[PDB]
Amino acid sequence: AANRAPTSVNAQEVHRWLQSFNWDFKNNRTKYATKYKMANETKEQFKLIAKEYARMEAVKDERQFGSLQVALTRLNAGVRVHPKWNETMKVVSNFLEVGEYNAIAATGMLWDSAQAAEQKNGYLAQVLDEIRHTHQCAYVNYYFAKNGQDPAGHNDARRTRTIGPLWKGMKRVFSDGFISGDAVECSLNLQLVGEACFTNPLIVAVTEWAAANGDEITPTVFLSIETDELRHMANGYQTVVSIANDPASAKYLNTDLNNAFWTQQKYFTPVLGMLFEYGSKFKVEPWVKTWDRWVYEDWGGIWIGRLGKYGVESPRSLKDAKQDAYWAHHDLYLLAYALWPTGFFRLALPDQEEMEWFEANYPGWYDHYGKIYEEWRARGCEDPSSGFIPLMWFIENNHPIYIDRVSQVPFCPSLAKGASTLRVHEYNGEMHTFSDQWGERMWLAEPERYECQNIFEQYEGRELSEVIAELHGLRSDGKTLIAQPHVRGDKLWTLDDIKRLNCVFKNPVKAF
Amino acid sequence: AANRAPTSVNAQEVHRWLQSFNWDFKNNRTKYATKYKMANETKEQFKLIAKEYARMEAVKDERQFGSLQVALTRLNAGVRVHPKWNETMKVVSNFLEVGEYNAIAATGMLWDSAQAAEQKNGYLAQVLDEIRHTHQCAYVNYYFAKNGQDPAGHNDARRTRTIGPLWKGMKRVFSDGFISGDAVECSLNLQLVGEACFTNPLIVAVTEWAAANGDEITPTVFLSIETDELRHMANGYQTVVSIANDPASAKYLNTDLNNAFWTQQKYFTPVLGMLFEYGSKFKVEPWVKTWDRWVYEDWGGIWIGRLGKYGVESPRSLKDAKQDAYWAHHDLYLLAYALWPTGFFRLALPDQEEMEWFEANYPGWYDHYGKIYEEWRARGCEDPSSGFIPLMWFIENNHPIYIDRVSQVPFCPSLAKGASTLRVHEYNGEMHTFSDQWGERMWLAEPERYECQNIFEQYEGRELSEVIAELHGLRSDGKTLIAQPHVRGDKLWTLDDIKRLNCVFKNPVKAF
Amino acid sequence: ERRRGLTDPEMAAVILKALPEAPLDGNNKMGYFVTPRWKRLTEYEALTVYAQPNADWIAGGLDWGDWTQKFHGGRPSWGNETTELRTVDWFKHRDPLRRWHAPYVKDKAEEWRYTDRFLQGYSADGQIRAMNPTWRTSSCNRYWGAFLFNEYGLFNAHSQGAREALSDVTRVSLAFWGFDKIDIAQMIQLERGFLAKIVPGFDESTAVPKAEWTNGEVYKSARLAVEGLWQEVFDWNESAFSVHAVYDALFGQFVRREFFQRLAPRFGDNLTPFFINQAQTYFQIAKQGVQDLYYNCLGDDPEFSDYNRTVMRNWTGKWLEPTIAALRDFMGLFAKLPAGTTDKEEITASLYRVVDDWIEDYASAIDFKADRDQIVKAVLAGLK
Amino acid sequence: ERRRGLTDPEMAAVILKALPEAPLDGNNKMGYFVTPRWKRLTEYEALTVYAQPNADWIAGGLDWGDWTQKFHGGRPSWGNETTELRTVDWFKHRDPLRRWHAPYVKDKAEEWRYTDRFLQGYSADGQIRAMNPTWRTSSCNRYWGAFLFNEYGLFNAHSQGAREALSDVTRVSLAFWGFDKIDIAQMIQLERGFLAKIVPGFDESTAVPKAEWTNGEVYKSARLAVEGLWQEVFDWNESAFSVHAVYDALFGQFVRREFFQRLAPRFGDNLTPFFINQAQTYFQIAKQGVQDLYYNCLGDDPEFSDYNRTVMRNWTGKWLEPTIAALRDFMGLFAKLPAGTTDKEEITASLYRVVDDWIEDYASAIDFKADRDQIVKAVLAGLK
Amino acid sequence: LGIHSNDTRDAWVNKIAHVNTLEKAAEMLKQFRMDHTTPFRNSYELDNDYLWIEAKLEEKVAVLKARAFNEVDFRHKTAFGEDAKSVLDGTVAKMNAAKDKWEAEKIHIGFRQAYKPPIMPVNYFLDGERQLGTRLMELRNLNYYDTPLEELRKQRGVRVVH
Ligand SMILES: [Fe+3]
Ligand SMILES: [Fe+3]
Ligand SMILES: [Fe+3]
Ligand SMILES: [Fe+3]
């Protein structure tokens, strides 16, 4: 023609000159405290340009929505899900949502940290991706509230999450863990350990367990989140590459990595086993098998082995984390069910097939956990007229529930089959409780990082139903609780049934 | 900055001036022969411009594909469909496709006929909608060939089509009747009858039989095709408004409408009923109930009643259409099955549960059709080692099959529980076979419009398998036929199995 | 409620038991028999080729026998008799760009919604403040405004080809070439409607542009060529070839690219270029289809190349004179611009760009011996 | 094969056996408690408001207690201490265009693909043949090129806001505001890369524009202000406000709209306006968000209006002086332009358009007394 | 035999090859349309192949017309050297003067047998279609159902085999 059609468009032709976009001036430095220097001339793996990033994601979106809005709505997919998994997805989607959201702020910090324009560009794509993911996890709760069998909790989790104890630990690994500290510590929490060891495996596993329990909404969304996650693990790798030639790495990198690994596994080993095994009806695989493949073999072995040439070693706490893995999820669900009035989701006792499954996969589950669940059932924990909440059994059998001060995981050392060591200290007029040597060192070395009030400190001397009423843990009839000790549509507990119990929180540390 | 943001030049703001875009010049007239004069100030009902048309459709597309590509592929919805319905969709999709396609050219002709800009513009949007619809019906065969249980016939129906007698009838109502012979007569076959009476009810009814039989692909596509169809019905209505003040309408309109109604119902009364009742396992309702609601009540009663003030009356052939309707589809399936080697799809005998269902809804079905299928079954019609095709039964029991000269519908007047009319005329050395007097009148008044060679005239003196081989009626392997007299996966028929029968076509008319 | 065979346990149990153990045929293509233009069959081609039920007696058809219903008098539903051109196979054509309605309305939708955003940006930014008022209220309102009718007539010249085209691939290209022309006509009116909203006293009514088109001297000869191409041509290929490879290739390109796109920027008009950018992107998208059909498929046909090049030379010669006359009258518009906008050296240069682009892209393909200097001298006879 | 609970007859039967007769709650609106800006809630609000886990001690937060892990030394993950502005509710802001992530990447993807189609059109149509060479290889290559680094700088100024924003709605607005700034910088480079394909020997390397930005004089104070707004402000609201309602509102609007948009047409360049229409669409979009936060939520805050307006006035004075220096130094570019391209009367009027729009849209909104004649006189001091 | 490939088609391809001049090719095409085309054809012996054989005869005549005629004659004359506009205007005046639908159909058929492209330029021929078809339909569709079938059979002159 008069010449022919070209374009440049292709992001690679423009990306070739990105990197030269940054210039030197005194004060072109990061605004954040850090022990490390990220090299300029750090290159990035994906040759993205803003416009092409947008096109790349828009294509994924139109397929995702489109399936959700036409076909799955016509098939009534929101309704035809096992009641237990409908409940598990309130936690899974809203809690993942906070991690998606704090990963926005986190790679804003890392974009600031980086001096290379390409590395800044790598973390910029992830800023934007974590905004996509925040609205995707919100859209899963949006759709199940709109179209599912129990919208309570899916519709208001951003405010009803605040009533219960498991929310605090989620905030430590996936909110504060991602943004508060040295930018590289945050990066090891988020990208090196968080996304590569747990989020990338989990999003795919959640999809399998979803598919088995009738859910085809969560595969539509989560399989689209997963197509982004590889650029995010390229970013973590690149954080290490950018700091590997600095003297500071050989002094500090493996300690920030070990503390980050401990942080993440501490919450995820018991919580993810608990939601997979106790929150499904159809079971895919035992968590003991899964954890070992994910943590020990794939991450600890392969992913970290790829970084050994940059001076990374496998965390020195990997062994301790594997000795508390087997029982920790079983241990935790006893406490989560015992504290069922403070959640925003309905919970069910194991049925006889599940107990048979648990006992085949965990020899000795029944004599410990099985017999307590049977005694709670007989005492009448599912029925409102019993006057029994399992917390009462912990009190009448003197089994204190402590909250860790660092990770915020609840633990009950007198009952636990897991590695449970209570450490209690008083410092400057306040008592603090720890569950393990790693969190204890973190607090001892860094007390002013770990000042979070726990559930018993804040609720002390308050009767349970007035906490629930104040923090709005109620269905739209203003009477029946969101959160139930059974997953059936009949004999739902109401605020008055809780008021009858006359259950008043006490701080467990006042007994020392 | 200075002033408010408007785009606010939405499609209506531009459409307001569209009528003035046409201008007068001596040769500004249709290029097509017509008896009617469409008025130049005709308005249209949907105020669209090209860009907004395109946006309005692209949004439907995203939903449509996206469901097909993520969730329906992952649910493997292409495979989990009843045998029978998979074969029905080879015909319903590819035969609807030719109607979609010829409707592009039909509304091209109508855009040329209208002199009012806005009338041209409404036909233009139908032009583009019918292109959309050709690729949508094509997409459905494409998805089923790519992902279903039997791709043969779904993958090549644009040429295996050509072997059988039912294709010829489809071409008469949805190809030729849409584009040949006065633009207004074509408009009455396409819009006022074709779409308003048959296609637009048919499309939702196909989605209802599709979903009962496990098909979720056809619902995804045909329910977005359906969102366009009201605009097309409005075009039929405006065709009548545009010619209603011309004296030519008082002379001619009800004759072209009567002819169009008889054209369209002659093929669709037997064909759609047969496709629904014999092409499904799970039934929604009997065809006699449906045909009565759609043709007599909805169309004949309410649709046409709206046009009485334009001098439109109910077709004088409506009562004849109703008396011939009842057994019409039953009589045709005997014939489609007798000629099963000529198709591109697999047919099944009625099973015991649906013989009971036919009996319950059509008293007398068993003593006539059930008895005959049982005899054919006893003779081994589905087993290739039998050496029997049901066509041999018609020959030995002396029941000739004739092909109309006008509608192309096969009829066997000596066996039919429905109409038994047979007129044979000889004119200029050629004989012609008719099955009703509406069609005999059309040939007699218009002989040169109706010269289509029929299957017996073309294949005369040819052995069955040579026709099938020549016209590619085979599966890849070059042996097994696409057509089958059962829907099972084993003991499929082969070219040599048909060849052993030395069945040679004979022109039935050569017995006179 | 309403049970569905995919998800209802009892129904799905019945369907699942009737299924074969593997697909009854392994060839899961669709269109596997179509000869691919590009090595692997594309989705464009699978969903489009052989959708038209032509019999073997219209070149390339796969069916057999006559049509079942013809026109009163015997005229066939599609016949060889509706065009002078002949070919070995009417289904040979491929749209380079491979458009099958879903990509096509997808792209245009992007353009509609970006136009909307652009307009809201422009009015809020206040960019009309830098635009010359004589250019705005006269050259945009009346002369650009009048070109609308030229695009609408060229759109309308496509109606018959939409009915008469002889294959799926030609008809889908033809239809998209015509829909883009009504789109341009609608965008010139959208621009006038935007201007009426942001500029006090601007009248968006088409009365003034229409009078110019029907009674002015500048677009006389253009309107007569359009009236001719639309309603006096009954061969569907003569219309699409003469609209796209002769008339719009010289006159339409001159007006869009060489008058308004060249001169509107000189008057602080960045608005009209936004819409002419759509018109030139469409002109170039259509050109590729036009060249494949008329030059690669008909012009280079293995049996009829010499025949078809003779008829296309004939039609180029027939419509080059109305085109030159259209161009000639349009030169009268330069006399209306403010002095100092353009001179004869720039105009002569722009004319040769149009003529040489046409000789390279179109005339040379069929060996039409065009002489650039005489064509520009002929047009230059109307400049003053 | 994997059995799925939605379609597997055994698994589905068990699931269906467990479902309740009707939903356990009729309240199926996922953000029912939010407080709608527009009467009916909106998906943008339901999917966005309250995703940030702020406790009540950061105004508007719904949670309670401290952060679980803070910085070494004790700094909170988010806190009141990171900005000077104060409010009754940080979740009050609403983006007027309601953009959550899917419509934002949809609009930009549209723009991207029509950019691709428009450049294919433009080079196939051969429209650089009418572009002035001097304008192209000097002003476009070097001075428009140099402006890329100003837009990259402004993009980077958003890094700290992206980590420190005190709500979800302010974070998502900020992030989209910044991503549009790097997009414009990458479009400047795309245009030079395009010209390198179309114009023999044009060099797409950034060395010449980069040397202009780091060592030339026209951009010296622009670079000094960008350097300071990016790396010297540690308050995330001071950067957002000062970049968008002072510097980019004045210097950026002058350079983009009143220099390159206004003069590239005069040199036969419709290519640079194509990319500036994007840049100006994005500036007008972000403006509505910046006015909603700074003026509608903060400046008009029920408890803190007077306080916030005092602080925003202080920052407008802080950053108006380096912004005037940026403009004043950029005035030197007109000396480098062919004679008679512009004159003092046109430059003055374009400066008054930028100042009056800024007073209308930003300065008057916080009651900052700006003297329009003083700002234009200070700027004009650098003109010859 | 063969649908699409057979001895009848081969025989005609072979004789169409060998027509070396326009006037002979066009004589053959015209004679072929009287003999094998429309319900008024002289025999139905080629019913299965005549549409295809006709297309091949058209190709040959089109090619020879284009080589023999200059550009204006290709546009304006018939293959027999008549002025196309004169033939078209004479046929329309004939049609317009037709006493009834019986007369009208013979004029419109006859025109198509004699003048179908490549005999007449398609621009002239489809304008013939346009005008001719309107009058034939106005005459045929008037009081369309009023003659009883027993009478219409006789008017058409059919032999009733039933
Ligand atoms: Fe994420
Ligand atoms: Fe991630
Ligand atoms: Fe349709
Ligand atoms: Fe339709």
Coordinates of C-alpha atoms in Angstrom, one line a residue, chain B residues 176-498:
Chain B
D176 CA -35.8 -20.5 -1.8
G177 CA -39.1 -19.3 -0.2
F178 CA -37.1 -16.6 1.5
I179 CA -35.5 -15.0 -1.6
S180 CA -37.3 -16.0 -4.8
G181 CA -40.5 -14.3 -5.9
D182 CA -41.7 -10.8 -5.0
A183 CA -40.0 -9.2 -2.1
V184 CA -43.2 -8.9 -0.2
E185 CA -44.1 -12.7 -0.7
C186 CA -40.5 -13.4 0.5
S187 CA -41.1 -11.1 3.5
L188 CA -44.3 -13.0 4.3
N189 CA -42.5 -16.3 4.2
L190 CA -39.5 -15.0 6.3
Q191 CA -40.9 -12.5 8.7
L192 CA -44.7 -12.6 9.0
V193 CA -44.9 -16.5 8.9
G194 CA -41.4 -18.0 9.1
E195 CA -40.2 -16.1 12.2
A196 CA -43.5 -14.9 13.8
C197 CA -45.2 -18.3 13.6
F198 CA -42.4 -20.9 13.5
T199 CA -38.8 -19.8 14.3
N200 CA -39.3 -17.6 17.3
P201 CA -41.5 -20.2 19.2
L202 CA -39.2 -23.0 17.9
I203 CA -36.0 -21.4 19.3
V204 CA -37.2 -21.5 23.0
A205 CA -38.9 -24.9 22.5
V206 CA -35.5 -26.3 21.2
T207 CA -33.9 -25.0 24.4
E208 CA -36.5 -26.8 26.5
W209 CA -36.1 -30.2 24.7
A210 CA -32.3 -29.6 24.7
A211 CA -32.1 -29.1 28.5
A212 CA -34.5 -32.1 29.2
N213 CA -32.1 -34.3 27.1
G214 CA -29.0 -33.1 28.8
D215 CA -27.8 -30.5 26.2
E216 CA -26.7 -27.2 27.7
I217 CA -24.9 -25.8 24.6
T218 CA -27.9 -25.3 22.5
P219 CA -29.7 -23.3 25.3
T220 CA -26.6 -21.0 25.5
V221 CA -26.7 -20.2 21.8
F222 CA -30.4 -20.2 20.9
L223 CA -31.4 -18.2 23.9
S224 CA -29.0 -15.4 22.7
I225 CA -30.3 -15.8 19.1
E226 CA -33.8 -15.3 20.5
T227 CA -32.9 -11.8 22.0
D228 CA -32.7 -10.5 18.4
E229 CA -35.9 -11.9 17.0
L230 CA -38.4 -9.3 18.3
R231 CA -36.6 -6.7 16.1
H232 CA -37.2 -9.1 13.1
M233 CA -40.9 -9.5 13.9
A234 CA -41.2 -5.7 14.1
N235 CA -39.8 -5.7 10.5
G236 CA -42.6 -8.0 9.3
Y237 CA -45.1 -5.7 10.9
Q238 CA -43.5 -2.6 9.3
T239 CA -43.5 -4.4 5.9
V240 CA -47.3 -4.6 6.1
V241 CA -47.6 -0.9 7.4
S242 CA -45.5 0.2 4.5
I243 CA -47.7 -1.3 1.8
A244 CA -51.1 -1.0 3.5
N245 CA -52.1 2.3 1.9
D246 CA -51.3 1.1 -1.7
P247 CA -54.4 -0.2 -3.6
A248 CA -52.3 -3.2 -4.7
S249 CA -52.6 -4.7 -1.2
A250 CA -56.4 -5.1 -1.4
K251 CA -55.8 -7.3 -4.4
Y252 CA -52.7 -9.2 -3.6
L253 CA -51.7 -9.3 0.0
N254 CA -53.9 -12.0 1.4
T255 CA -53.1 -14.3 -1.6
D256 CA -49.3 -13.9 -1.0
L257 CA -49.9 -14.5 2.7
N258 CA -52.0 -17.6 2.1
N259 CA -49.4 -19.0 -0.1
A260 CA -46.6 -18.2 2.4
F261 CA -48.5 -19.7 5.3
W262 CA -49.1 -23.0 3.3
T263 CA -45.4 -23.1 2.2
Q264 CA -44.1 -22.8 5.6
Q265 CA -46.5 -25.0 7.5
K266 CA -46.3 -27.8 4.9
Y267 CA -42.7 -28.6 5.8
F268 CA -42.7 -27.6 9.5
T269 CA -46.0 -29.3 10.7
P270 CA -44.6 -32.9 10.0
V271 CA -40.9 -32.0 10.4
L272 CA -40.7 -30.2 13.7
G273 CA -43.1 -32.6 15.3
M274 CA -41.0 -35.6 14.2
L275 CA -37.7 -34.0 15.4
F276 CA -39.2 -33.3 18.8
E277 CA -41.1 -36.5 19.4
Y278 CA -38.9 -39.1 17.8
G279 CA -35.5 -37.3 18.2
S280 CA -35.6 -37.1 22.0
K281 CA -35.6 -39.5 24.9
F282 CA -37.3 -37.2 27.4
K283 CA -40.5 -35.4 26.1
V284 CA -41.7 -32.0 27.1
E285 CA -45.3 -32.1 25.6
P286 CA -47.0 -33.7 22.6
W287 CA -46.7 -31.9 19.3
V288 CA -50.5 -31.8 18.7
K289 CA -50.9 -29.5 21.7
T290 CA -47.9 -27.4 20.7
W291 CA -48.9 -27.0 16.9
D292 CA -52.3 -25.9 18.1
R293 CA -51.1 -23.2 20.5
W294 CA -48.4 -21.9 18.1
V295 CA -50.2 -21.9 14.8
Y296 CA -53.9 -21.6 15.7
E297 CA -53.9 -19.6 18.9
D298 CA -50.7 -17.5 19.1
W299 CA -50.1 -16.8 15.4
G300 CA -53.4 -17.3 13.7
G301 CA -55.3 -15.8 16.6
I302 CA -53.3 -13.1 18.3
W303 CA -50.4 -12.2 15.8
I304 CA -52.5 -11.9 12.7
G305 CA -55.3 -10.3 14.7
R306 CA -53.1 -7.3 15.3
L307 CA -52.9 -6.8 11.5
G308 CA -56.6 -6.9 10.8
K309 CA -56.7 -3.1 10.6
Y310 CA -54.3 -3.3 7.7
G311 CA -56.7 -5.6 5.9
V312 CA -54.8 -8.8 6.8
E313 CA -57.0 -11.8 7.5
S314 CA -56.3 -15.4 8.7
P315 CA -55.1 -17.6 5.7
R316 CA -58.0 -19.3 4.0
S317 CA -55.9 -22.6 4.2
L318 CA -55.7 -22.6 8.0
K319 CA -58.5 -25.2 8.5
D320 CA -57.0 -27.5 5.9
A321 CA -53.6 -27.2 7.6
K322 CA -55.3 -28.2 10.9
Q323 CA -57.1 -31.2 9.5
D324 CA -53.9 -32.5 7.9
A325 CA -51.8 -31.8 10.9
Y326 CA -52.6 -34.6 13.4
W327 CA -50.9 -37.6 12.0
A328 CA -48.5 -35.7 9.6
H329 CA -45.3 -36.1 11.7
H330 CA -46.0 -39.8 12.5
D331 CA -46.5 -40.6 8.8
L332 CA -43.2 -38.8 7.9
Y333 CA -41.0 -40.6 10.5
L334 CA -42.0 -44.0 9.0
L335 CA -40.5 -42.6 5.7
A336 CA -37.4 -40.9 7.2
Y337 CA -36.6 -44.2 9.0
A338 CA -37.4 -46.3 5.9
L339 CA -34.8 -44.2 4.0
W340 CA -32.3 -44.0 6.9
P341 CA -29.1 -44.6 4.6
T342 CA -29.8 -41.3 2.9
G343 CA -29.3 -39.2 6.0
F344 CA -26.3 -37.7 7.9
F345 CA -27.6 -38.7 11.3
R346 CA -28.4 -41.8 13.3
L347 CA -32.1 -42.8 13.9
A348 CA -33.6 -45.1 16.6
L349 CA -36.8 -47.2 16.7
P350 CA -39.4 -46.0 19.3
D351 CA -38.6 -47.9 22.5
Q352 CA -41.3 -49.5 24.8
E353 CA -41.7 -46.5 27.1
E354 CA -42.1 -44.0 24.3
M355 CA -44.5 -46.4 22.4
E356 CA -46.6 -46.2 25.5
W357 CA -46.2 -42.4 25.5
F358 CA -47.2 -42.2 21.8
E359 CA -50.2 -44.5 22.4
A360 CA -51.4 -42.4 25.4
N361 CA -51.3 -39.2 23.4
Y362 CA -52.3 -40.4 19.9
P363 CA -55.0 -43.2 20.2
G364 CA -54.4 -45.5 17.3
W365 CA -50.6 -45.0 17.0
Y366 CA -49.7 -48.5 18.0
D367 CA -52.2 -50.4 15.7
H368 CA -50.6 -48.6 12.8
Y369 CA -47.1 -47.3 13.4
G370 CA -46.0 -49.4 16.5
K371 CA -47.1 -52.6 14.7
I372 CA -45.0 -51.6 11.6
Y373 CA -41.9 -50.7 13.7
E374 CA -42.2 -54.1 15.5
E375 CA -42.3 -55.9 12.2
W376 CA -39.2 -54.0 11.0
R377 CA -37.5 -54.8 14.2
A378 CA -38.4 -58.5 13.9
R379 CA -36.8 -58.5 10.4
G380 CA -33.5 -57.1 11.8
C381 CA -33.6 -53.6 10.4
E382 CA -30.9 -52.4 12.9
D383 CA -28.6 -55.4 12.4
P384 CA -26.3 -55.2 9.3
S385 CA -26.3 -59.0 8.8
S386 CA -30.1 -58.9 8.2
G387 CA -30.0 -57.7 4.6
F388 CA -33.1 -55.5 5.2
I389 CA -33.7 -51.8 4.9
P390 CA -37.4 -50.8 5.7
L391 CA -37.7 -49.3 2.1
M392 CA -37.9 -53.0 1.0
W393 CA -41.1 -53.3 3.0
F394 CA -42.7 -50.5 1.1
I395 CA -41.8 -52.1 -2.2
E396 CA -43.0 -55.6 -1.2
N397 CA -46.3 -54.3 0.4
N398 CA -46.9 -51.9 -2.6
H399 CA -47.0 -48.5 -0.9
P400 CA -45.1 -46.0 -3.3
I401 CA -43.3 -43.0 -1.8
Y402 CA -43.8 -39.9 -3.8
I403 CA -42.1 -36.5 -3.6
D404 CA -44.4 -33.5 -4.1
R405 CA -43.3 -31.2 -7.0
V406 CA -43.7 -27.9 -5.0
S407 CA -42.9 -28.5 -1.2
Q408 CA -40.5 -31.4 -1.7
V409 CA -42.1 -33.3 1.2
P410 CA -42.2 -37.1 0.7
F411 CA -45.6 -38.7 1.2
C412 CA -46.9 -42.2 1.0
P413 CA -50.7 -41.7 0.3
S414 CA -51.7 -45.4 0.5
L415 CA -50.3 -45.8 4.1
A416 CA -50.8 -42.4 5.6
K417 CA -53.3 -42.0 8.5
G418 CA -53.2 -38.4 7.5
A419 CA -54.0 -37.0 4.0
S420 CA -54.2 -39.5 1.1
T421 CA -54.5 -37.0 -1.9
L422 CA -52.3 -37.9 -4.9
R423 CA -52.5 -36.0 -8.2
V424 CA -50.2 -37.0 -11.1
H425 CA -50.3 -34.7 -14.1
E426 CA -48.2 -35.0 -17.3
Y427 CA -47.2 -31.8 -19.0
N428 CA -44.8 -31.5 -21.9
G429 CA -43.4 -35.0 -21.5
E430 CA -42.9 -34.8 -17.7
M431 CA -45.0 -36.1 -14.9
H432 CA -45.6 -34.3 -11.6
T433 CA -46.8 -35.5 -8.3
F434 CA -48.8 -33.4 -5.8
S435 CA -50.1 -34.0 -2.3
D436 CA -52.6 -31.2 -1.7
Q437 CA -54.5 -28.6 -3.7
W438 CA -52.7 -25.5 -2.5
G439 CA -49.5 -26.8 -3.9
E440 CA -51.1 -28.2 -7.0
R441 CA -52.6 -24.7 -7.7
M442 CA -49.1 -23.1 -7.2
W443 CA -47.6 -25.5 -9.8
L444 CA -50.5 -25.1 -12.3
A445 CA -50.4 -21.3 -12.2
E446 CA -46.6 -21.1 -11.9
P447 CA -45.0 -24.2 -13.5
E448 CA -41.6 -22.5 -14.2
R449 CA -41.1 -21.7 -10.5
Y450 CA -41.3 -25.4 -9.6
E451 CA -38.9 -27.6 -11.6
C452 CA -36.9 -29.2 -8.8
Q453 CA -35.6 -32.7 -9.6
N454 CA -36.3 -35.1 -6.9
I455 CA -34.3 -37.8 -5.3
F456 CA -35.9 -40.6 -7.5
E457 CA -35.3 -38.7 -10.7
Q458 CA -31.7 -38.0 -9.9
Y459 CA -30.8 -41.4 -8.4
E460 CA -32.9 -43.4 -10.9
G461 CA -31.3 -46.6 -11.8
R462 CA -28.5 -46.1 -9.2
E463 CA -27.5 -48.5 -6.6
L464 CA -27.8 -47.0 -3.1
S465 CA -24.2 -47.3 -1.9
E466 CA -22.8 -45.7 -5.1
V467 CA -24.9 -42.6 -4.3
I468 CA -23.7 -42.6 -0.7
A469 CA -20.0 -43.2 -1.6
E470 CA -20.1 -40.5 -4.3
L471 CA -21.6 -37.9 -2.0
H472 CA -19.3 -38.7 0.9
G473 CA -21.9 -40.1 3.3
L474 CA -19.1 -42.0 5.2
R475 CA -17.2 -41.7 8.5
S476 CA -13.4 -41.3 8.3
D477 CA -12.3 -44.9 7.7
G478 CA -14.1 -44.8 4.5
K479 CA -16.4 -47.6 5.4
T480 CA -18.9 -47.0 8.1
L481 CA -21.9 -44.9 7.0
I482 CA -22.7 -41.7 8.9
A483 CA -26.3 -42.7 8.9
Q484 CA -27.4 -45.6 11.2
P485 CA -30.8 -47.3 12.0
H486 CA -29.9 -47.4 15.7
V487 CA -28.1 -45.1 18.2
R488 CA -25.8 -47.7 19.8
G489 CA -22.0 -47.7 19.5
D490 CA -21.5 -51.3 18.2
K491 CA -22.7 -53.1 15.0
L492 CA -22.6 -50.0 12.8
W493 CA -23.6 -50.5 9.2
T494 CA -20.7 -50.1 6.5
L495 CA -20.9 -49.5 2.8
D496 CA -20.6 -53.2 1.9
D497 CA -23.6 -53.9 4.1
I498 CA -25.8 -51.6 2.0

